[PDB]
């Protein structure tokens, strides 16, 4: 598996907040409004984004070369100061 | 001062305050030994300090003591070779030791602040044995208006788990105690695992109280996260491969001998919460090299 | 005979010989009840036997008792039994029950004979808790001029592993006793795992003393064989999925302290029963054939 992504898509955060992690939209996309009274006791959920653990990624192709997933940490250390991690 | 004074001071410092680890007592004893010297040459002082550390290690056999001694030895002397008068150098190293002791004591609050945000609302937490930093983490979590349930293990042969259970009950938290052979049975209801540490090794694994390996394997079989809380002065230089590579001076306290510690591999661990930040097991190799100046 | 007489006979039979299982005691009590029943009816006899089995199961909560009673009931009725006279039918079922009792007492030796050949020379064997059939297997193996070493677990909370070790002492085999939390530490030195059983389920898994699931998982993590010894009269009809599905009348005996746990068929290698040597897939239809 290969991921193609530039450098401005790297963020100094860890997956611990969840909740607002996904992004929910109107259930109009899934079930049309013309379904009648059935739309009075049915719950519809329409997420957008998804989380993927790092054990399923093999390579990263960037604007400087190819790196293993374990190298990413080092990159962060040379991009952002640890003080400004939380605005 | 002689070795008898060293041992007496060590034991008195340990007994006076129960809420203190062995490493802090050893560091304070070494600082007191430094303040009571009369030599004139630096390497004579180095030999005296090495002998003192070796003697201190023989009383208590724990991993953290030796690492703390070595870190104290090689941190005390960043710049102590400039002037030709022994007094100035001795004063500078005494000041550096005091600064190191000051900086040691702020790690627990940082660990709790970094770790308390990983606990959900209405969750079940499993734990093993007794550890003060875990208790501090839970106190910080309950101070933020959150609810959870706790399972604990009796942790034979000293029944250390009941002490933690009694301490937990004082904070009105639902806490239950299970057997030492029912870990796999109870893993079904759990959500995450948080344990303490006794020492961090080069490849990312840990050394802890006996019984952690089976719990880690069982949690791995059912895909549950495994979290570790540790401190900076517990980093040791060792690269074990299997269970019999651990030095014998740590296994048996001073099969039927019932070894007290065991080693957990880096492939069964999710995240590590240290005072240096949050590190995956892959970054420990770099951080250990950087720390050992 | 009445309920009090039933319980008295059951407890006396259990107490007389410690080298005896609950199933044989239940079968003997049921045969005694059969030999002391009056009336002229078949349905009355069936109802009396069912009530006796229920009141026997009430006293002691073990899986083998119910299966033994059900198998007894099914077996004694597999003949003509049409005739015209009550006495002839009664004698026929009494003879069938006696033959069944004779057949039951000839399985441990067969299991030992079939299983003793799987032990290598100079090997380390890990086992758990106390079980007489494993002791018989090891006695048969040592009678064949072989050498090995044995590890056992203290088996909290009643410490039966020490009793097992003391029994093993008379056979002058090296034996070691480890803690209940040192299984993962000691798994490296072992070569094979042999455990007993308390009940065999439909899909192939087993039900045993608490602490077997973790041993099975640890052995699977390091690619070691897992062997099981069981008996024909311990096959029960049940299809559990997870640890919750086990009936509560077996979990808690007459803070959580469960007494038994269930192990899946995908963590087992072979089963040594009196029927023969079966892969876990063979039980699924051997059980169907058995419950005729």
UniProtKB/Swiss-Prot annotation, chain A:
The entry's protein name is: Translation initiation factor eIF2B subunit beta
In terms of domain of life, where is this protein from?
Answer: Eukaryota
Disorder named in the UniProt entry: Leukoencephalopathy with vanishing white matter 2: An autosomal recessive brain disease characterized by neurological features including progressive cerebellar ataxia, spasticity, and cognitive deficits. Brain imaging shows abnormal white matter that vanishes over time and is replaced by cerebrospinal fluid. Disease severity ranges from fatal infantile forms to adult forms without neurological deterioration. The disease is progressive with, in most individuals, additional episodes of rapid deterioration following febrile infections or minor head trauma.
Homology family: Belongs to the eIF-2B alpha/beta/delta subunits family.
Q: Which organism is it from?
A: Homo sapiens (Human)
Function of this protein? Acts as a component of the translation initiation factor 2B (eIF2B) complex, which catalyzes the exchange of GDP for GTP on eukaryotic initiation factor 2 (eIF2) gamma subunit. Its guanine nucleotide exchange factor activity is repressed when bound to eIF2 complex phosphorylated on the alpha subunit, thereby limiting the amount of methionyl-initiator methionine tRNA available to the ribosome and consequently global translation is repressed.
Subcellular localization is given as: Cytoplasm, Cytosol
Covered part of the full sequence, start to end and full length, is 265 to 351 of 351
Quaternary assembly = Component of the translation initiation factor 2B (eIF2B) complex which is a heterodecamer of two sets of five different subunits: alpha, beta, gamma, delta and epsilon. Subunits alpha, beta and delta comprise a regulatory subcomplex and subunits epsilon and gamma comprise a catalytic subcomplex. Within the complex, the hexameric regulatory complex resides at the center, with the two heterodimeric catalytic subcomplexes bound on opposite sides.
From Swiss-Prot, chain C:
The coiled-coil regions, if any, are: none
**N6-acetyllysine found at:** 35
Q: Which SUPFAM superfamilies match?
A: NagB/RpiA/CoA transferase-like
User: Is the keyword Cytoplasm assigned to this protein?
Assistant: yes
Keywords associated with the record = Acetylation, Cytoplasm, Disease variant, Initiation factor, Leukodystrophy, Protein biosynthesis
GO MF term list: guanyl-nucleotide exchange factor activity; identical protein binding; translation initiation factor activity
- Where is this chain's protein located in or outside the cell? Cytoplasm, Cytosol
Q: Which GO terms describe its cellular component?
A: cytoplasm; cytosol; eukaryotic translation initiation factor 2B complex; membrane; plasma membrane
Q: What Gene Ontology terms for biological process does this UniProt record contain?
A: cytoplasmic translational initiation; oligodendrocyte development; response to glucose; response to heat; response to peptide hormone; T cell receptor signaling pathway; translational initiation
What main location does UniProt list? cytoplasm
- InterPro entries, alphabetized: eIF2B_alpha/beta/delta (IPR051501), elF-2B_alpha_N (IPR042528), IF-2B-related (IPR000649), IF_2B-like_C (IPR042529), NagB/RpiA_transferase-like (IPR037171)
Q: Regulation of activity: what does the record state? A: Activated by the chemical integrated stress response (ISR) inhibitor ISRIB which stimulates guanine nucleotide exchange factor activity for both phosphorylated and unphosphorylated eIF2.
Q: What is the role of the protein in this entry?
A: Acts as a component of the translation initiation factor 2B (eIF2B) complex, which catalyzes the exchange of GDP for GTP on eukaryotic initiation factor 2 (eIF2) gamma subunit. Its guanine nucleotide exchange factor activity is repressed when bound to eIF2 complex phosphorylated on the alpha subunit, thereby limiting the amount of methionyl-initiator methionine tRNA available to the ribosome and consequently global translation is repressed.
Connected disease: Leukoencephalopathy with vanishing white matter 1: An autosomal recessive brain disease characterized by neurological features including progressive cerebellar ataxia, spasticity, and cognitive deficits. Brain imaging shows abnormal white matter that vanishes over time and is replaced by cerebrospinal fluid. Disease severity ranges from fatal infantile forms to adult forms without neurological deterioration. The disease is progressive with, in most individuals, additional episodes of rapid deterioration following febrile infections or minor head trauma.
- Note the subunit structure: Component of the translation initiation factor 2B (eIF2B) complex which is a heterodecamer of two sets of five different subunits: alpha, beta, gamma, delta and epsilon. Subunits alpha, beta and delta comprise a regulatory subcomplex and subunits epsilon and gamma comprise a catalytic subcomplex. Within the complex, the hexameric regulatory complex resides at the center, with the two heterodimeric catalytic subcomplexes bound on opposite sides.
- What family, per the record? Belongs to the eIF-2B alpha/beta/delta subunits family.
Protein's name in the database: Translation initiation factor eIF2B subunit alpha
Could you tell me which species this protein originates from? Homo sapiens (Human)
Provide the gene name from the record: EIF2B1
